[PDB]
Design an enzyme around this catalytic site. Structure first.
Site, mmCIF file in Angstrom:
data_model
loop_
_atom_site.group_PDB
_atom_site.id
_atom_site.type_symbol
_atom_site.label_atom_id
_atom_site.label_comp_id
_atom_site.label_asym_id
_atom_site.label_seq_id
_atom_site.Cartn_x
_atom_site.Cartn_y
_atom_site.Cartn_z
ATOM 1 N N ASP A 27 23.484 8.192 18.944
ATOM 2 C CA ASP A 27 22.310 7.475 18.415
ATOM 3 C C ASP A 27 21.936 6.434 19.405
ATOM 4 O O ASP A 27 22.232 5.297 19.072
ATOM 5 C CB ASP A 27 22.676 7.198 17.075
ATOM 6 N N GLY B 287 14.072 -1.562 10.250
ATOM 7 C CA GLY B 287 13.135 -2.122 11.422
ATOM 8 C C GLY B 287 14.200 -2.788 12.285
ATOM 9 O O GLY B 287 13.647 -3.497 13.365
ATOM 10 N N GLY C 233 18.048 0.233 16.280
ATOM 11 C CA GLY C 233 17.754 0.081 18.004
ATOM 12 C C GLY C 233 18.071 -1.382 18.445
ATOM 13 O O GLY C 233 18.119 -1.187 19.584
#
Length: 247
Positions: free
Chosen positions: A90, A192, A195
């Site tokens: 990921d 949110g 990443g």
């Protein structure tokens, strides 16, 4: 980020905001003049590359700043092993359309070697502009949030995720992942934040130890944030960037 505090401008200069069709969807970490690392899950195949932007040098997302730079992406490269939600790999390399210039507010974060070990309990920090509680948006002007979180081994983390687990809704922390946070909850990354960076302190420097992978725990007990280990991808990142844009 729930249960953290507001960072100050310039504090985490590698943190970027990734937007899709103008809306913040994920965090990312600047790693060179033209490359950002984020999570593969932030870049579904159905999305159009041209609709993304990366905002760098931002402290408050909603505030105008002369220090911030916004860029489109030339390339989005998820790791090939990322097959589906929860999957390993990921992580994604994003190449900005044009190189940026580093400044007081825009700086890359050092990547760890393939065999760098960041010990259990090391106090790292996760940052992001994700929700500040379940289904509660960070309130405008959206100052970057930060949260200090001790590393939790994938083994411990898997035991926690097993507590009151929904049989159908698995949460397996893969071999390329680590966790960080608190058994008792109240303090984690939220929607949110994924990443974005888990920055760990070593030898007076900061390293990108992790990239938020399951970033929806949002303060649930027994559900610490799960991060892809950058070390697991050091070789791949180095190979892709060297081939595609040698220095």
């Amino acid at each position: 980020i729930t249960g953290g505090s507001s960072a100050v401008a310039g504090q985490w200069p590698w943190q970027v905001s990734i937007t899709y069709e103008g809306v913040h969807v994920c965090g990312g970490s600047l790693v060179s003049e033209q490359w950002v690392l984020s999570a593969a899950h932030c870049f579904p195949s159905e999305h159009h590359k041209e609709a993304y932007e990366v905002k760098l040098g931002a402290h408050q997302l909603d505030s105008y700043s002369e220090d911030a730079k916004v860029s489109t992406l030339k390339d989005i490269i998820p790791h090939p092993s990322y097959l589906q939600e929860g999957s390993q790999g990921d992580i994604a390399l994003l190449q900005l359309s044009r190189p940026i210039t580093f400044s007081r507010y825009i700086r890359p974060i050092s990547l760890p070697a393939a065999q760098a070990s960041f010990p259990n309990g090391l106090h790292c920090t996760v940052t992001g502009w994700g929700h500040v509680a379940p289904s509660v948006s960070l309130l405008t002007p959206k100052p970057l949030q930060q949260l200090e979180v001790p590393l939790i081994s994938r083994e411990t983390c898997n035991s926690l995720y097993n507590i009151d687990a929904k049989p159908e809704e698995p949460h397996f922390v893969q071999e390329d992942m680590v966790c960080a946070g608190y058994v008792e909850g109240g303090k984690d990354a939220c929607q949110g934040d994924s990443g974005g960076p888990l920055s760990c302190p070593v030898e007076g420097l900061w390293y990108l130890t992790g990239i938020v992978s399951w970033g929806d725990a949002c303060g649930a007990r027994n559900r610490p944030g799960v991060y892809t280990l950058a070390s697991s991808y050091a070789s791949w990142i180095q190979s892709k960037v060297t081939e595609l844009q040698p220095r």
